[PDB]
Nucleic acid binder design. Structure first.
Length: 49
DNA sequence: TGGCCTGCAACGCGGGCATCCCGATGCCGCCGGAAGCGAGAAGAATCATAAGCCGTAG
């Protein structure tokens, strides 16, 4: 939902992950930073999904 | 297509009968072995008590 509200489509340029992590911690998931980053890494691994 | 079962006819040998000689055997007495499973001991299958990682959380 945060990535959709931010407006980062597939046909756009890349963006830094720290901004997205900070936004998620600030608005919706204020439960640390390690879990969100680990979830992002897990979603980014091709051999994991 | 080749071989087998059976009817007809001819031949032979053994079933039955008795008994004399005979071989097992039931019984009796004396001696042997194995069973008797109960118990002691060893081996093995199974049960009971720690970790390692799977991913977000502190």
């Amino acid at each position: 939902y945060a990535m959709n509200v931010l407006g980062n489509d597939w046909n756009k340029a890349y963006k830094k992950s720290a901004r997205v992590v900070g936004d998620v911690i600030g608005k919706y998931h204020p439960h640390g930073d390690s879990a969100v980053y680990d979830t992002i890494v897990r979603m980014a691994q091709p051999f994991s999904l």
